[PDB]
């Protein structure tokens, strides 16, 4: 019985030792899993996580998904409004422009035609387009604001008008002085005080 | 020996107790790892997973990668075909248009010129362009279908023609009535029954 | 005491057995965690990982983020340079072009006008624009190289000029023969040896 107990004790010792080795294996295996690189992955914008789902956040004016990342899903608009333009050099006059702005994705294309005459005093005129001078400002006013990248440079503008019964047309340029205001510069077809009529302006911006 | 066995038993008890505490530590540590947030991350379109690899799925007509996400990789096409256009108001006639469609990324730019005369009966005419009236329909017909976003609005179209030995040219507008059919509306340069010739149409769509 | 030791031994055996079952549970639970799918996720371009952060890598000429993935952030440029163009069929002459290149995102729009006369010998002329013939090559020369996708096709070019006191204007086409060289083809308004002047070229490329 002392001998029987001693044999039982030797058996227990063996089992305890097995358990001890199984616990050392589990300790190593759990050490790995605690350090696995994929734990604490995070996602910077335009990637985001909500309830375990990783998403690409998409500006619908620029892109969308149809399985794959493709172009804009937002509805195009053709806005129609009146914009009073201001002579800001070579003219102190104003002129009403009937404006169609075709907004498709983040491109806004302007087609403008004037009503009335603009009095000019020099051979070149600067004509300013400030969002505050728009009558019945559209809802999606964001469609009329150029992006910061677009604003950094002058952009091409087609201009045409009549003066003293003759048509003039020029490839000219505009530039934004701020996010709400651009000015175009164009020749007036002559010198001195005169009136130009049937002013048309065609240009486009990236918003 | 009873005393020796009792000392051995006290030693085993101590070892069993250590094992027990090592197992409680492992149980807590495994509880953490079972709940780690990064487990069961999923990826919604345009993101996808295949064999552990997370990818951005890219429409090659819109974007591609050159390390960074950049613009289209698909080859531009210049398609040339004949499109029979239909007078649908102010005309019951038809006219064959020779069409160059310049497809670059998801922009398709149309340059059309007519062969023949179109009989008009009013001062304004509606001219319809249905994909079914294209002769030798191109392979990439998808390049001639506007996106849902683009279809939501009228879009600018340049039109010019001759009538009674005089040129006319107008900035006009088209609109899609369905994904396969657009109609342009333009003045005819006069009134009554007449024939216009040398019709040219320039416009573009987002696909 | 033999009986007391035997009772202690039976108690230890019970504890060892509990420990053994707790270790088998932990072994199974650790087996799961070792195989979890989210372990060893990787990210293919334009997705990337740095220090646990997953990012969308963005070409700033094409896209940016303002929370959501939107259009370009790079500053637009209006470049002005002189490009000597080469007659390469129907002319052996050269002509200096004053070029405005409006670079907005990955679109580059060219507005060119000539200084001088170009001698032509046929009714059609090919005029070549090689980046090596640009005087004072701009810094961002990449803005003048079409993308591989754009190069695959001919593209529309507007051309106008004067010849013998009369204006001519044509919708024409260019094509890249390599990434640095495009040629435009246009009618010369007549036949035989003559001089054209006031050449203007308007076209655009995707870069
Ligand atoms: Cl004993
Ligand atoms: Cl144990
Ligand atoms: Zn013995
Ligand atoms: Zn894990
Ligand atoms: Zn006034
Ligand atoms: Zn003792
Ligand atoms: Zn007919
Ligand atoms: Zn007993
Ligand atoms: Zn020469």
Q: Assign residue C68 the CATH number of its domain.
A: 2.10.25.20
Point out the domain boundary residue: B23, B50, B75.
B75
Burial class (CB in 10 A: 0-12, 13-18, 19+), B109: middle
State the ligand closest to the CA atom of C2: 1
Indicate the SS3 state at residue C144: helix
Nearest to C183 by CA among C91, C57, C53: C91
B16: closest CA of chain A, how far (Å): 7
Cis peptide before B46 (omega within 30 of 0): yes
Interface contact flag, B71 C56, Cβ < 8 Å:
no
- My answer on whether C93 and C184 are in the same domain is yes
Q: Answer yes or no: do B44 and A55 touch at CB < 8 A.
A: yes
**Do A57 and A140 belong to one domain?**
no
Looking at the structure, tell me whether residues A115 and A151 fall in a common domain. yes
DSSP conformation class of B24? H
Q: Is the C-alpha dihedral spanning B27, B31, B32, B38 positive or negative?
A: positive
The answer to whether residues C61 and B63 touch, using CB atoms and an 8 Å cutoff, is: no
Q: Are residues C171 and C141 in the same domain?
A: yes
A40 touches chain B (CB under 8 A): yes
Looking at the structure, do residues A140 and A107 belong to the same domain, yes or no? yes
Look up residue C105 and give its DSSP letter: T
- Paired residues of C112 in beta bridges: C99, C201
| Contact list, B47 vs chain C (CB under 8 Å) | 47
Same domain, A29 and A84: no
Contacts with B19 from chain C: Cβ below 8 Å: 19
Q: Are B201 and B157 within 8 A, CB to CB? A: yes
Longest dimension (CA), chain B: 132
Q: How far is C134 from chain B (nearest CA, A)?
A: 26
For residues B155-174, one letter each, b for 16 or more C-beta atoms within 10 angstroms of the residue's C-beta and e for the rest, the string is bbbebbbebeeeebeeebbb
Q: Are residues C91 and C157 in the same domain?
A: yes
Q: What residues pair up with B77 in beta bridges, in sequence order?
A: B103
Q: Record the tokens describing residue C178, joined without a space.
A: 């390599």
- Looking at A25, A56, A75, the residue that finishes a domain is A75
**Residue A150 is nearest to which of C70, C76, C109, comparing CB atoms?**
C76
Residues B149 and B56 in one domain: no
Reply yes or no: is the peptide bond before residue B53 cis, omega within 30 of 0.
Answer: no
DSSP-assigned beta bridge partners for residue C197: C117, C162
Answer with the one of A75, A99, A133 that is the final residue of a domain.
A75
- Quote the minimal CA–CA distance from B161 to chain C in Å: 15
- Cα angle C32, C33, C37 (rounded to 5 degrees) comes to 90
Q: Which range of residues forms the domain containing residue C1?
A: 1-35
Q: How far apart are CA A161 and CA A95, in angstroms?
A: 13
C113 with C31, same domain: the answer is no
Q: B62 contacts in A (CB within 8 Å)?
A: 63, 69-71
Query: How was this structure obtained?
Result: X-ray
**Angstroms from C186 CA to nearest CA on chain A:** 21
CB-nearest partner of B19 from C19, C150, C155: C19
Answer yes or no: do B199 and B111 share one domain: yes
In Å, what resolution does this model reach?
2.3
**Residue A169: which H helix or E strand, with range?**
strand A166-178
Taking ligand 6, which is a single-atom ion, which protein residues have CB atoms under 5 Å away?
A: B 3
Task: Tell me the pairing of strands C53-56 and A42-43.
Answer: parallel
Q: Do C76 and A173 touch (CB under 8 A)?
A: no
Identify whether residues C126 and C41 lie together within a single domain. no
The span from the CA of C61 to the CA of A174, in Å, is 21
d(CA C207, CA C143): 6
A74 reaches B (C-beta below 8 A)? yes
Alpha-carbon radius of gyration of chain B: 36
C111 and C53, same structural domain? no
Q: Give the count of domains, chain B.
A: 3
Closest CA to B104 of B176, B203, B200, B206: B206
Taking a C-beta distance cutoff of 8 angstroms, is the pair B23, C22 a contact? yes
Tell the residue number behind the tokens 């030995």, with chain if given: B165
Can you give the length of chain B in residues? 207
Of C5, C56, C104, the CB nearest to A150: C104
CB spacing of B62 vs A56 below 8 angstroms: no
Q: C170 — contact with chain B (CB < 8 Å)? A: no
């Amino acid at each position: 019985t002392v001998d029987g107990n001693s044999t039982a004790i030797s058996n227990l010792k063996s089992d305890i030792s097995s358990n001890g080795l199984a616990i050392t294996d589990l300790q190593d295996r759990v050490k790995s899993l605690e350090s696995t690189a994929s734990h604490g992955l995070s996602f910077s914008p335009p990637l985001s996580v909500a309830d375990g789902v990783v998403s690409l956040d998409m500006d619908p004016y620029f892109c969308s998904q149809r399985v794959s990342l493709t172009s804009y899903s937002a509805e195009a608009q053709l806005m129609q409004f009146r914009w009073m333009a201001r002579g800001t050099n070579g003219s102190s006059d104003t002129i009403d422009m009937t404006v169609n702005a075709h907004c498709h994705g983040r491109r806004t294309d302007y087609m403008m035609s004037s009503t009335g005459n603009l009095t000019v005093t020099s051979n070149v005129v600067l004509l300013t387009f400030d969002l505050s001078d728009i009558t019945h400002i559209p809802s999606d006013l964001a469609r009329l604001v150029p992006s910061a990248g677009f604003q950094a440079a002058s952009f091409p503008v087609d201009v045409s008008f009549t003066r003293d019964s003759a048509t003039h047309a020029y490839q000219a340029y505009g530039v934004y002085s701020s996010s709400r205001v651009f000015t175009i510069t164009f020749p007036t077809g002559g010198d001195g005080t005169a009136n130009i009529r049937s002013l048309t302006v065609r240009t486009g911006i990236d918003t």
